[PDB]
Ligand binder design. Structure first.
Ligand SMILES: C[C@@H]1[C@@H](NC(=O)/C(=N/OC(C)(C)C(=O)O)c2csc(N)n2)C(=O)N1S(=O)(=O)O
Length: 165
């Protein structure tokens, strides 16, 4: 299903791509959302994935929170993938701009290990305020299942690749 990815390790793949467009095209078993603990999908990856579901992800998420309460930072829940995927794994990476502990990034990535294959963004990057080069390192040192990383920004993609150890 997936095409055009650079192989970084035995199990981590990366591509310069819009995760929304990739989800729509591939319809993978699991797409990862870069969520917050309230599953309020306002901006960033979450805002874009939600908009691609015509707000159906937000409606489902509102029901989830009403029933179960908020996630923990570093935690996850599995919901519908709607039109993008079979399932959406909503994962909460720490938001450095809210002062959340960057050490929880490894816990966040550990959620990915419950799924054999996933399409995902770099956790805690973008508006979550962490260094994406750090995030990718934590990814490669934590995830053991097959992860296809979609990086929207071409300059960031190039830097992630060119700096990868
Ligand atoms: C240059 C990238 C920029 N990334 C983005 O803004 C990028 N958003 O998010 C992430 C998740 C990082 C991505 O590119 O996958 C995006 C989505 S739609 C658009 N026009 N740009 C960001 O703060 N950096 S930095 O290299 O980590 O400074």
């Amino acid at each position: 299903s997936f095409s055009g990815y650079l192989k970084l390790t035995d199990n981590v793949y990366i591509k310069n791509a819009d995760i929304v467009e990739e989800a729509k095209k591939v319809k993978p078993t699991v797409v990862v959302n870069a969520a917050n603990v309230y599953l309020k999908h306002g901006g960033g990856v979450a805002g874009a994935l939600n908009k691609a579901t015509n707000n159906a992800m937000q409606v489902e998420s509102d029901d989830y929170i009403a029933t179960n309460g908020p996630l923990k930072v570093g935690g996850s829940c599995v919901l519908s993938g709607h039109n993008l995927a079979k399932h959406c794994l909503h994962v909460v990476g720490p938001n450095v701009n809210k002062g959340e502990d960057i050490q929880l990034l490894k816990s966040a990535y550990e959620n990915f290990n419950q799924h054999e294959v996933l399409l995902a963004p770099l956790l805690s990057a973008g508006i979550f305020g962490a260094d994406p080069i750090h995030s990718l390192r934590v990814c490669v040192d934590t995830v053991r299942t097959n992860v296809y990383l979609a990086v929207f920004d071409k300059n960031l993609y190039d830097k992630l690749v060119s700096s990868f150890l």
